[PDB]
Every structure is written in C-alpha cells, then in structure tokens.
Symmetry: C4
Subunit: 144 residues, 4 copies
Amino acid sequence: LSQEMIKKWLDEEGFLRMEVPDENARFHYVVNYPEDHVIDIIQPAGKDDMILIACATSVSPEHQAGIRALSMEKRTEFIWKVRFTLNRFGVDFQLDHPENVLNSYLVTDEIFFDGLSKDRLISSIKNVFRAKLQVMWMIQERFG
Amino acid sequence: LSQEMIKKWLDEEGFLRMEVPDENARFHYVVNYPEDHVIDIIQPAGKDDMILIACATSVSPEHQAGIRALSMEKRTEFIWKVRFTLNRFGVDFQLDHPENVLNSYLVTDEIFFDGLSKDRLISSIKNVFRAKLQVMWMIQERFG
Amino acid sequence: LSQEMIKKWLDEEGFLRMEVPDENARFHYVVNYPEDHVIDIIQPAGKDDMILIACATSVSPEHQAGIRALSMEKRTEFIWKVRFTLNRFGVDFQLDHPENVLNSYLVTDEIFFDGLSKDRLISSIKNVFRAKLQVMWMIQERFG
Amino acid sequence: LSQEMIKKWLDEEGFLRMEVPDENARFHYVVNYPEDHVIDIIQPAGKDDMILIACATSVSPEHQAGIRALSMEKRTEFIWKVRFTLNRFGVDFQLDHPENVLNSYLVTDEIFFDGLSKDRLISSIKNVFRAKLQVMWMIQERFG
C-alpha cells in the first residue's frame, strides 16, 4: 500500500517500465529515465520502510579502451577525480576499477518513508541520474 | 486551490506579472525575478499535481560572436564547462549550440503539489535563477 | 504568532542577543553566531509569512588595501571568484566593490513560515554563516 | 521517544553498534557506518531538543609525517584546501593542526527534534561521513 503510491507515482510521470522478481526484495521496479536509461527502485528484503534508488552504469568496451592506454599514474588520477566528484552528489557509490581501469560504477540513494512523497521520490531519482551523469560526461569529455 | 495559492504567493512577492494561454498547460503564470527577468511557471496538460519552473535564456549576438571566434576545441571545452556547472544545481537543462556556439540554454526544476509550499515554491524559483545566472557570469566573465 | 517561537528558539540556543527599532520591519532580532559574530533576523514591514537571515560583512581597510595593491585585472578576477563562490551556497548576496575593490558583501536567505521550524532556522543561519565565512577565508588566505 | 526512535532506527539499518555511558549527554550511541568506521550520535546534556552527529578522525601518525615534510607554505596550502572543502558540506567542523600539521579533524551536525525523522537522521549521518571522507581521501591521494 505504501508501495502502491510509489508504483502509482512512477506511472503518473511515465517513468515505470515493469516490475521484476527479486529473491531479496519486498519488491523491485525498473524505471526508465530519461529515454531508455535504466534506474532501479528496490525495497530490500529486511526493510519495509525504505526504498533504495540504484543506477548501475557499466563503462563501455569503447571507453576502458582509453583508460587502459593511460599510465597507471593517470588512471589513479582519474579514479580520484570521479571519486571526489560523486562524493559531492549526496549519494553512495561503488566503483569497479580492477587495474584502475573503470569497468562499472553504481550510484545509490535511499529514501525512508518518514520522508517519502512524490516530490521527494522524483527528486532523488533525478539526482541519482545527474550524479552518474557527470561521471559519464567526464569519461566522455576525455575520450569522446 | 493549489492554483490560487501559487498565484497568491507569487503576487505576495511581486514575482507575478501576468498569465498567458498555453494551449499545452492547464495554466501558465509568468514571473519576473529579479526586476525584469523572465521566469515561467507551467502546469503540463496531463499533470495536475505539479508545476514546472522554466527559464530559457538566449545568449546575446555579441556573446555568440565571442564563442564563434574561438577554435572548435576552445568551444567544446566551454560547452563541457557549462554542462558540468549546471549539472550541480539540481536542475534539469537543455543547451542549444549550433556548431558548439551556445545559442540558448534552458534551465528547469519542478515541484509536485505533494510537497508544494510557499517556502519551497520561492526557493525553487531562486535556485533556477542562480543556475542560469552562473552560466551567464561565465559568458560575461570570458566575453565582457 | 510565529515571532514568539522564533524568539523562543534563538534564546534557547543562546544565539539571541537583543532587539532593535527597525522602522522597516515588523521585528528585528540581532543574533550572535558564532561567538561575537553578528547575524540579523528581519521581517519586512509588509510581510507576515517570512523572515530574513542577513549577514553584512565589511572588509577591513588592510585587506581592502591588498586588493587595492593588485592590478585592475587581478581585481576583476577576484570579484568573479567570490561571485561564483557565493552563488553555490543557495543564499542571495549584495556585492560592494567600487573599482573592483571589495568594500563589503552581504549574504541573505529567507524562510517562509510554512517551512519554519527550529531545525530549519538554526540551519538557515549556519548556512548563511558558511557562505560568508568562505569569502572571508578566500580573502585572508590571499592577504593574511 | 526521540531517543527511543533513534535507537530503533539505527538498529533497523545495522548502524547501532552500542550505547555508552556519558556524563555530559542524555544518551550516546556509537555507530558503525560504513562497516567498521565509527560515528557518535549524542544528545548534549543541557539540550532537550537536539542531537549531535559527530565523527572524530585522527590524522594517522604516518600521514602527518607526510605533511610534516611539506614546507610551511605547502602545509598552509593544505589547511586552506581542507577548510574550503569541509565548509561546502553544510557541517560544523574543527581542525587540530599543531604547526599546520593536521593532527585530527571533527565533522559535526545537529538535528533538532523539530525536524527529526529516520530519513533525516540517516542522511545526516551519511553527510557527516562523506565530508570526513573527502578530507581523508585528500590525505590519501597525496600521501597514499
């Protein structure tokens, strides 16, 4: 019921794309914002008073191409950059950089129900997008 | 009633100027913040639980001159600067740059009645302003 | 109604110092945060639903002397820096710079009663202070 | 009720590590967020409507050796940099830098019961951490 508001707000805005089975979640929705970009709305198993907004972004073959070319020095420099940048967007993140080559990066933000609202919901989603966007623009401005 | 509140709040601050027939919007007030600066308050057709605060800006012909003069590299560098700048204002935006010569840039944020208040309506207007204002300062700082 | 609460809270935190006969405001409580620092809480004469957190700061003649000692280009460069800095704080500001020699600077923020609460007020005050402190530290870091 | 809710919330998220006797506080919870990192949720003794979120950090002995070596100028360059950074996270902080050689740093924030809620409380905790994290990351990027 608290989740029907969620389910409803995502459709009122043409966001929601489909629900998804999930062995470790009371529920899970796959939102499309913007365009065909994919963002996840997951309410973890144990907690029923929160929703976690996640966005998984895998660095293309095309891109870790250039990051591989750089010296180990310049890679580190880049992992440090993307790191400071994201720790500025009010989100939590996970970086996947084996040899300091960035394969993927997850941007997350949770909203508890004490403060849930359509306005709040739609904001966090948009913010998580912008957080992961700057990183995508960083790689892009460097490597095209 | 959400509508008369928005309207009275804006009137209460002198932000209001007049309406206008937006054949796409349930309503469309026109604010003037600051002084003679033009900001739009729009409620999309389908949406009856939200207002959009948009502010499109056209860069003067004398400024588009400055940026057109520059090499393509210095231009692409400039567009990246403004993308990275705006993206940290928690606002949506859209740049119109012919051959990377910024023509116009639209900055937009939106409130859902779910969390609409005067304190919030006003703060959102002023934030949309600062975001398009700092982009204006980048242009004026570089081109006079 | 809300005036007695705003007053009650400032005093609860010590913050409050005294009041003063401002002919342009319903009330005007002069706060002291941090210790010895002066911030002003005003409420325009013809405004019920709101207060203003204002912090005026004049640049010592010494510091003003150092920015005097710079070129007219190094001065313009410095003005832009404080402009870009403050516009990222979500506060409004008035800049006083005769010939790009910073005289004083004013940072303000307003709270509309449908958003008022102790938590929020205390925050808006601290944020106004941080916006101010930043420019002051920029000044000192450059000129002792 | 607030202490009770706070205890309850921390435990629901895995944060609440343990409570600890403090003569100068109504209560005092110890948090382990991220997983082995520690934070202090405290209600000042003489405060009936506020909680303090504190994160103390000791500049490791062999990281101050790093900044011991830097010339005074270079050290001061670092103190300003860490001061401008932290003042951007909307947190109160305290720097222990003996000879401009960073000893330890405290990042803090308050939440008045006026605005207390789980969504609010947890965000505060993550913001205090992120700020303290950026300073740590700054030290590590430089000295490893």
